[PDB]
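DATA SHEET
Item: assembly model
Revision: 1
Owner: S.N.
Input lines:
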Amino acid sequence: QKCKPTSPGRRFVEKVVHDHLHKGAPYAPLVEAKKRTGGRNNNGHITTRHVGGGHKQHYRIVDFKRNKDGVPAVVERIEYDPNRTAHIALLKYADGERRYIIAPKGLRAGDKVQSGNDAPIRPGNCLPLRNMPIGSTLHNVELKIGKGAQLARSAGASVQLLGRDGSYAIIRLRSGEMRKVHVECRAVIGEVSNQENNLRSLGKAGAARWRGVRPTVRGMAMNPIDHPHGGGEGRNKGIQPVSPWGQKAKGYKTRTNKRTTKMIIRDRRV
RNA sequence: AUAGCACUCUGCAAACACGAAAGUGGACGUAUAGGGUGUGAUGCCUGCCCGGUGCUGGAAGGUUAAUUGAUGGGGUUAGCG
Ligand SMILES: [Mg+2]
Ligand SMILES: [Mg+2]
Ligand SMILES: [Mg+2]
Ligand SMILES: [Mg+2]
Ligand SMILES: [Mg+2]
Ligand code: NA
């Protein structure tokens, strides 16, 4: 979906149509307020730069735990969620309860989904990892028992269940890393719906300003008091590239955790 | 400064930043996501060099601190004079 260059701004704009969406107001009981922090903590200092000035957004409560076991539900509609890059689906259970989930690929209104041990192997069903079939592709993987999905939630993300022993299951993450997961944890069958997210193009600075991103200033343009890459009578790049606080930026590993080293089987060749 | 491009780090109690700690932002986000660095629409593209510094992976052949103290010598009483 390219835009005709009627203006210098409209020349390099690419968007996704996805006309199958709801195109309406979201479910009111499942919507709560949400405000912009501006990248500042309770002390008032800027802890994360390049954040501020976006569009007003409400928060849609997505049910990540899916603890309603053995109750079949039907898909009502697919909606647009500004809080994430994926699409959401509205489910209606037998008793009449309404909940929001992460819509897998191809899920449309009228589909039947269950979250239990005896659930069949269909896209959108949540099952423990031991009941999962070997070699399949999963999403919304759970790490701690009972907390809810924490992995493969972005648009188009998916993991593969390589193998499972008696006590653990081996999965390969999207980054290329193989790690161990408890066999009691749960996952969902299929891949996340929104797949054409990376194919979009903003086209102008206005879109980045709409999405709540502030301009980035290179360290070279700053003064010696501001950035280590400061000073010089012209365009100069004096020292090894570092962060504004003195940390190396090229090929320097920053992982320091020692508590969960046993889980990672093979690294992503970092 | 900018949309675009590339490199690199981060598997989530994430990397990173604030504080003396608790705690907070990142994010009520989950690698099509977040941070750092360089270049700057688009067309055609982007040659050689790992000697130096840096980073990454190893051997552990040489040395190496903290920790221990078999000895060796000295001082002073006591035994043989
Ligand atoms: Mg930034
Ligand atoms: Mg940029
Ligand atoms: Mg300085
Ligand atoms: Mg300089
Ligand atoms: Mg150019
Ligand atoms: Na070198």
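QC remark: DSSP finds one helix and 15 strands in chain A.
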